[PDB]
């Protein structure tokens, strides 16, 4: 591009730069690790000296970004620095860093503070073996596209079925008579209850089954709208606590029908699906081994 | 004649006719429910109890 009037830094660019910026980003990772998160605006001594250290780590990466940006075009000039694959990531990193660091000393919140955990990704840039390893997974997840478009649609179908069948059913429970305390037993978790139905009537002596109960898992597991129904369907599909949802529906509406909904979702959603991905990926491994066996 | 005069479709169309007759009688035979408050035994149906 422009003449060699600005490239006063391309002389030490080819020095062993990797064996110093790697140790710097590793020390940055360590200073990120030993940080202690304290509740409600509290801090200690070591947490104060680790924010003065984010000025030594944000000033090295930034001057190296300058050294690499002006050594190749104004910004790109041929899509050189910015459009280099693993040089845009580092730019966003050191461009959010300074941004939020000067923002923290302009109102003198913590949302952009959490973008500080992307700096550990720089180590992948540091070693090219990791760079080629990381690009193989995004190369092998394209055959898993017709499986994801099937899992998404199955989750959306079962969410709507559960929204039609169970919406607003797990809202009664048995409190103590005249109280707002749920009445349970030693290891029992608060489950739904039924009055005038095939559901469960609860047994504790001074207890009555009335409504106004936010739901089973503090109000998180229920088919009350599309978002929560999607959430509980997805949770069941991972085969984690699906029997709890089944049992709560059994307590709410009745024992004989609801299993059809959950044994079908666990067979189709979990076993059939994981069997699909265990075949599609092993087939991809086999074909990428066979194409290389001819080399 | 593959699906229409095979034996495996005729056995099923046989099994259908049993359901046909038992259903056309079930609408008319009120012999499926009793109630006894407690001698006033009842017999429910679809049209008249």
């Amino acid at each position: 591009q422009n003449p060699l009037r600005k490239a006063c830094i391309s002389i030490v660019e080819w020095k062993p730069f990797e064996t110093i910026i790697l140790l710097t980003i590793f020390a940055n990772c360590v200073a990120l690790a030993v940080y202690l998160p304290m509740p409600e605006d509290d801090n200690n001594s070591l947490n104060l000296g680790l924010e003065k250290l984010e000025y030594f780590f944000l000033t090295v990466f930034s001057i190296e970004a300058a050294m690499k940006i002006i050594a190749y075009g104004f910004l790109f000039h041929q899509d050189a620095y910015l459009r280099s694959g693993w040089n845009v990531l580092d730019f966003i990193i050191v461009f959010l860093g300074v941004f939020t660091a000067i923002l923290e000393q302009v109102n003198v919140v913590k949302a952009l503070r959490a973008f500080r955990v992307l700096r550990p990704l720089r180590l992948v840039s540091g070693v090219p073996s990791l760079q080629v390893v990381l690009n193989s997974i995004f190369k092998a997840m394209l055959p898993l596209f017709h499986i994801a478009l099937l899992v998404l649609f199955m989750v959306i179908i079962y969410a709507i079925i559960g929204l039609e069948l169970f919406k607003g059913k797990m809202h009664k429970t048995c409190y103590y008579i005249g109280t707002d305390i749920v009445a349970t037993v030693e290891n029992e978790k608060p489950s739904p209850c039924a009055r005038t139905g095939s559901g469960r009537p609860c047994t504790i002596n001074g207890s009555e089954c009335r409504g106004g109960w936010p739901g089973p898992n503090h109000g998180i597991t229920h088919f009350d709208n599309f978002g929560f129904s999607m959430l509980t369907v997805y949770q069941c599909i991972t085969m984690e606590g699906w029997t709890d949802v089944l049992y709560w529906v059994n307590d709410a509406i009745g024992n004989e029908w609801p299993w059809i909904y959950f044994v079908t979702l666990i067979l189709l959603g979990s076993f059939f699906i994981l069997n699909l991905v265990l075949g599609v990926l092993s087939g991809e491994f086999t074909k990428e081994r066979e194409k290389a066996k001819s080399r | 004649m593959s699906p229409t005069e095979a034996p495996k479709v005729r056995v099923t169309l046989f099994c259908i006719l049993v359901g046909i007759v038992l259903a056309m009688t079930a609408v008319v035979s009120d012999h499926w429910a009793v109630l006894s408050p407690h001698c006033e035994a009842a017999h429910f149906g679809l049209w008249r109890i």
């Binding site: - | 099923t12 259903a23 109630l35």
Partner: protein
Amino acid sequence: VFSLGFLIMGTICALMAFRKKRDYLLRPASMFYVFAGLCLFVSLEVMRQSVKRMIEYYYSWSFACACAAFVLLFLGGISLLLFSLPRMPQNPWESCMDAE
């Protein structure tokens, strides 16, 4: 009444499917039976819950008749539809709705 109407409309297609090589006609007929069956079941529902809103209760004779007619019609329509629908291809060339 709707269930018996479905049985009526299904027997027609079940019989007209025997002539003129109208085998395709056995595909809708089956389905009608299914709904008939299904209808019978929800019929059950109503009566059942009525029995538990009126004392003792007990189903003696015709509940078996209905619980048999429903399951037979339902399973038979489903299996008739499975037998009229040709086959899952099972081969890279075979296909559903293939020429004879």
